[PDB]
Design a protein around this ligand. Structure first.
Ligand code: 3PH
Ligand code: 3PH
Ligand code: PLM
Ligand code: PLM
Ligand code: PLM
Ligand code: PLM
Ligand code: PLM
Ligand code: PLM
Ligand code: PLM
Ligand code: PLM
Ligand code: PLM
Ligand code: PLM
Ligand code: PLM
Ligand code: PLM
Ligand code: PLM
Ligand code: PLM
Ligand code: CA
Ligand code: CA
Ligand code: CA
Ligand code: CA
Ligand code: CA
Ligand code: CA
Ligand code: CA
Lengths: 536, 536
């Protein structure tokens, strides 16, 4: 009945479906847990105990990562008029008595989660893992800031509480691999983007240095790199160039052509690269998954074959479909599937004897049958097939961005803290006061979390920018809001706009071939997929 | 020497390069000019005379289509304070004496251009063409409005001066074919977009009706379909939902999730369809060009064969390779290209040619040699290979949109004419006055031409919209500015964003393959293009 616990039995025909199930649904057994001579030791007994308790672990992660909004501003301590909310937010701030209660519970599960794969890896393997020295070093930094906050800089706990949450889920770590391979392409297209703003902030400063434009908005060259940056974003379109329009009507020809080249030529070609870098980096992940599948099926192959000659006979395959617990009657399948597998050796009268034959067989049952069952509108179809596929497909690629904003909030709370006050006199002339944003704030953590969202939508995103270049007084605040743009024109065009285009072309292709596959043959022909995945 | 015209010689050897050149560089011979028994008749003498005078014709089209900005408002005649510019623009308005001078010169050349292919088509063919009746009916409407304006509604000349200009250039007419085939896909994705604003203007009206949101912005349901439409555009992001955030901070979760689903899920999937509809409609145009190329090469085949058995002789191929004027060493090519063409009949040793064999041979010399002589940074390359390709590739697809704006100006001048005055008292409370746009205006034609551009960039595009819902006093002005969105966030996601993605993937497969186009073989194989275009 219950096929959950299996490492302690694991017969020669039963420890197949330990490996043959995990090759289908694609989980991971660790490579140290895979390379054993026995492959059913107390390592593997303790390993599936990690996957049992997994719902405790993610519930710790969102405990640790939703900690930060409930917790105090960096500076209420120098602040005058502390408790009275000057545009703060309605969430409570957990007190110092409430501090050690919430972090020690959080570390009591993180210390279990980090030092658990010692129970199935060697200490020369665990400590030489390099995605796991990172995860241990993140714990010790939290263990400092627990005990420092107990026994009483800028307190780098809330940055580490993100990076633990990034590395601990596989999806957000699998995503972040792509953003390292894409980064060597994106920085070149960033470098030919900055050249576009610089060469066209020069002509916009050459042309208008005499007139009523350069008297008013385009004074210094550093305030035409800055303005023409915001025109590239479109979000300041007619306001930049009214007094160059009002003076000579012909100066729209500069500005209606720069935004035309800027937004409709370059911005699609930053999208084109970051989509074309995605297609190569996604292929490097999927082939990084099939070698994980082939390195599972090769374990399943040699587990059955006793002499390890390199082959398995037909009768030695017939016993597997019953071990699969898949279909009712056995002998009508394996000889039927032999022709269905694209190449049969026919060196013996019955068997096809290779390793690569089985590694395609166990996946060939997967696409067709789905008969395991572990007991424990045509007009609108291609749109809502994708649109419902994309609620869990963009949970990593919109989870990375929610982690990028949990960093910029935590930077942006600290750099830009209790400045929007009720009584800051620079504020009441800014664009925050006149547009009455005066909230969307940065004065706390969740005030900042929303504000980065409006900066992410680009809905009037320069109101916040040009206020904090006047509240902080420096032009160095500009680099907070330019780096949000740059990093999230990868992340909003990689991870989303390139993904939702490819996600449509799957649920197009599954509609364009479902008319073809059901009419081409009664059974599935495998190489049409070999020409179909490389088709577009 | 001079071999420009040569329809009057047109030998068995001279009229071949009449057909063999036009099959390469792809001009058009009309199908009535193609189906003749002689194919060099008194009709064909005049056909190449049409292509000689072609620079007169484009220069007339731009005369006819850049007429409109230089010409008067629809209503200066009821207007008080006529000559004094109340926010008008600096272009002159050509007078009634200047009327008949500029239009009769313009109509002197339409009547040439329209009734010229009578000189190479029958009058039962010219008048049964369904395009060439549209282009005649457009002339007669201009001939009315010339003679009406001479001998002294809304004067539908400026709409026809666009549609003549659309049909007369081939690329703007070739483009507009696609926008009819895409239209049956776009109206469904319009219809499921329209449902998204309706179902989410309902929940935003169910939820916020009691509170300080529905007291202030969300009063009627027609003013939440309207507001949540502008949130879909993002361009009104925090202003809509301040007093539903100021009241409860928890009600950003509605509005930061609706824009997230709106702009990052739907808007990419309207892009995905309109890109996917482009790929099919562009393929239907390119195969509409090869059957035009095959229907030229079959004329070249039938010109050579006097027997018309179905085959041409090899010695006849070689002496017409010489008439091609291609290369200096002739006889080492034809048997060399026999292997280089993917198939050879090989029925006799020399002379066994199919019509499909020659149909690639004339293409075989084209893709490789490029020798005719009509005498008359690795890091950044794939970006600027596209970015320089796209100055003439997006001239049709940004010429259609410049024609869509030349209609909406001409509509939008007439509906919205003299409203923004110096002394309209509704104006000086509107968003046009406070943001001081107040030009961007619609009071003339080129004031309107710019204003549709800012509406096209979406830079604060609702300032104009909510002004004309208060200047015209009705909510029917909204439909002017919602149709500009709907029709041209097709045309800016079809014709640009989908095109610039495909234009990258060509000029990136001419680099990914170009290392293989020099290392795999020194002489080009044709069937890698069968595996290069179908697979990428
Ligand atoms: C604010 C809270 C939002 C709640 C989002 C719900 C996320 C559900 C997570 C439940 C399982 C997570 C395990 C973590 C990753 C490794 C395992 C895996 O491969 O997942 C397979 C899993 C499906 O397989 P199964 O759950 O094992 O059946 O796919 C997923 O749905 C989760 C993928 C990533 C999970 C974390 C990333 C999102 C967190 C950031 C919050 C984003 C807020 C932005 C709002 C957008 C809404 C439109
Ligand atoms: C307001 C002033 C705008 C002036 C812009 C000038 C644009 C130059 C286009 C002149 C060429 C007209 C071709 C005649 C009809 C097409 C036939 C053909 O096969 O063309 C081959 C031609 C190349 O072959 P070739 O010239 O024969 O060597 O392709 C083209 O270059 C033009 C294709 C589109 C046809 C005209 C559409 C443009 C007019 C709308 C103006 C757009 C303003 C928006 C600003 C965008 C700038 C970034
Ligand atoms: C790409 C993702 C963007 C994510 C933007 C994050 C949205 C966070 C907003 C949550 C605000 C919660 C305020 C709590 C108010 C209360 O209950 O008292
Ligand atoms: C393609 C790049 C060309 C444009 C590079 C030009 C930038 C150099 C600086 C221009 C003049 C600086 C204006 C005043 C600066 C100052 O001395 O304070
Ligand atoms: C990526 C290109 C631009 C990115 C960010 C734009 C920054 C340009 C703004 C420079 C500030 C103006 C220089 C200060 C002038 C002064 O000291 O008076
Ligand atoms: C991280 C590097 C990206 C580039 C950042 C800015 C590029 C050059 C810096 C702009 C400052 C130029 C201002 C000099 C002119 C002036 O202020 O008068
Ligand atoms: C992923 C870990 C963090 C990555 C970048 C975070 C740290 C960059 C800036 C954080 C502190 C900078 C603030 C300095 C100015 C100040 O404190 O007044
Ligand atoms: C997840 C990566 C994010 C890290 C990049 C953000 C850091 C860039 C600037 C942070 C603030 C620096 C400017 C502060 C100006 C000031 O001191 O007032
Ligand atoms: C990735 C970030 C891009 C960099 C954006 C530039 C931010 C730096 C500011 C530019 C000019 C400021 C120099 C003047 C200094 C001052 O006035 O205090
Ligand atoms: C997608 C294309 C958008 C096109 C927008 C059209 C720009 C037209 C603006 C031209 C204004 C001409 C006024 C000149 C005044 C004068 O020279 O006297
Ligand atoms: C998926 C579609 C569901 C939403 C459709 C609801 C639209 C019906 C109109 C709602 C009530 C109108 C509100 C007052 C208008 C009036 O009577 O004047
Ligand atoms: C594409 C979806 C909507 C398209 C344009 C939005 C139109 C909704 C606005 C309706 C106006 C309000 C109805 C009038 C109310 C009244 O008479 O008091
Ligand atoms: C061309 C059709 C597209 C749809 C246009 C609008 C869709 C329904 C019309 C909106 C008006 C609904 C207003 C009812 C509520 C009210 O007036 O108070
Ligand atoms: C392609 C030819 C034109 C297509 C659509 C153009 C005509 C639609 C509207 C034109 C006039 C409508 C104005 C009516 C209101 C009024 O005149 O007061
Ligand atoms: C190129 C196609 C464009 C045709 C579509 C535009 C016509 C839709 C509305 C035009 C104005 C209609 C609303 C006018 C309101 C009023 O009378 O004040
Ligand atoms: C394709 C165009 C989309 C249509 C957008 C709707 C345009 C008008 C819809 C709302 C009009 C409100 C009806 C009340 C009329 C009035 O108050 O005068
Ligand atoms: Ca064996
Ligand atoms: Ca067999
Ligand atoms: Ca304002
Ligand atoms: Ca805006
Ligand atoms: Ca013959
Ligand atoms: Ca031969
Ligand atoms: Ca925008």
């Amino acid at each position: 009945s219950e096929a959950i616990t299996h490492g302690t039995p694991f017969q020669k025909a039963a420890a197949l479906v330990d490996l043959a199930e995990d090759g289908i649904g694609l989980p991971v057994e660790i490579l140290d847990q895979s390379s054993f001579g026995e492959s059913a030791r107390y390592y593997f007994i303790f390993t599936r105990l990690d996957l049992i308790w997994s719902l405790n672990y993610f519930a710790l992660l969102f405990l640790n990562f939703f900690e930060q909004p409930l917790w105090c501003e960096k500076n209420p301590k120098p602040s005058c008029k502390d408790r009275d909310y000057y545009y703060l937010g309605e969430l409570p701030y957990l007190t110092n008595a409430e501090s050690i209660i919430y972090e020690v519970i959080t570390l009591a599960i993180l210390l279990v989660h980090t030092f658990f794969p010692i129970s199935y890896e060697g200490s020369r393997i665990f400590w030489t893992s390099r995605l796991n020295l990172v995860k241990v070093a993140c714990v010790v930094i939290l263990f400092v800031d627990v005990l420092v906050d107990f026994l009483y800089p800028f307190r780098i706990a809330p940055y580490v509480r993100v990076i633990i949450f990034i590395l601990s889920i596989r999806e957000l770590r699998d995503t972040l691999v792509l953003l390292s391979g894409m980064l060597g392409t994106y920085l070149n297209i960033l470098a030919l983007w900055m050249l576009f703003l610089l060469f066209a902030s020069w002509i916009a400063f050459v042309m208008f240095e005499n007139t009523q434009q350069g008297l008013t908005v385009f004074t210094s060259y550093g305030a035409t790199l800055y303005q023409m940056f915001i025109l590239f974003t479109t979000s300041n379109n007619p306001d930049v160039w009214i007094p160059a329009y009002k003076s000579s009507r012909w100066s729209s020809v500069f500005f209606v052509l720069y935004v035309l080249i800027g937004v409709y030529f370059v911005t699609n070609l930053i999208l084109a690269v970051v989509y074309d870098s995605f297609k190569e980096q996604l292929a490097k992940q999927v082939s990084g998954m099939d070698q994980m599948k082939r390195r599972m099926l090769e374990k399943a192959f040699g587990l059955i074959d006793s002499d390890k000659n390199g082959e398995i006979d037909k009768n030695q395959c017939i016993k597997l479909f019953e071990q699969l617990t898949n279909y009712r009657t056995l002998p009508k399948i394996s000889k039927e599937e032999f022709g269905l597998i694209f190449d049969e050796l026919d060196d013996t009268r019955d068997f096809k004897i290779n390793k690569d034959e089985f590694a395609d067989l166990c996946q060939a049952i997967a696409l067709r049958f789905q008969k395991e069952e572990v007991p424990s509108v045509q007009r609108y179809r291609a749109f809502i097939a994708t649109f419902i596929t994309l609620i869990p497909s963009l949970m990593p690629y919109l989870g990375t961005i929610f982690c990028v904003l949990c960093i910029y909030c935590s930077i942006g709370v600290q750099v830009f803290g209790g400045l929007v006050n009720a009584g800051n006199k620079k504020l009441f002339e800014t664009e925050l006061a006149e547009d009455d944003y005066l909230l969307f704030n940065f004065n706390d953590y969740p005030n900042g979390m929303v504000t980065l969202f409006n900066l992410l939508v680009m809905g009037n995103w320069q109101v916040w920018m040009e206020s904090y270049k006047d509240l902080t007084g420096t032009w160095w605040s500009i680099t907070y809001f330019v780096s949000f743009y740059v990093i999230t024109i990868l992340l909003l065009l990689n991870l989303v706009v390139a993904f939702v285009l490819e996600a449509f072309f799957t649920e197009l292709d599954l509609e364009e071939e479902e008319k073809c596959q059901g009419q081409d043959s009664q059974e599935k022909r495998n190489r049409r997929r070999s020409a179909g995945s490389k088709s577009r």
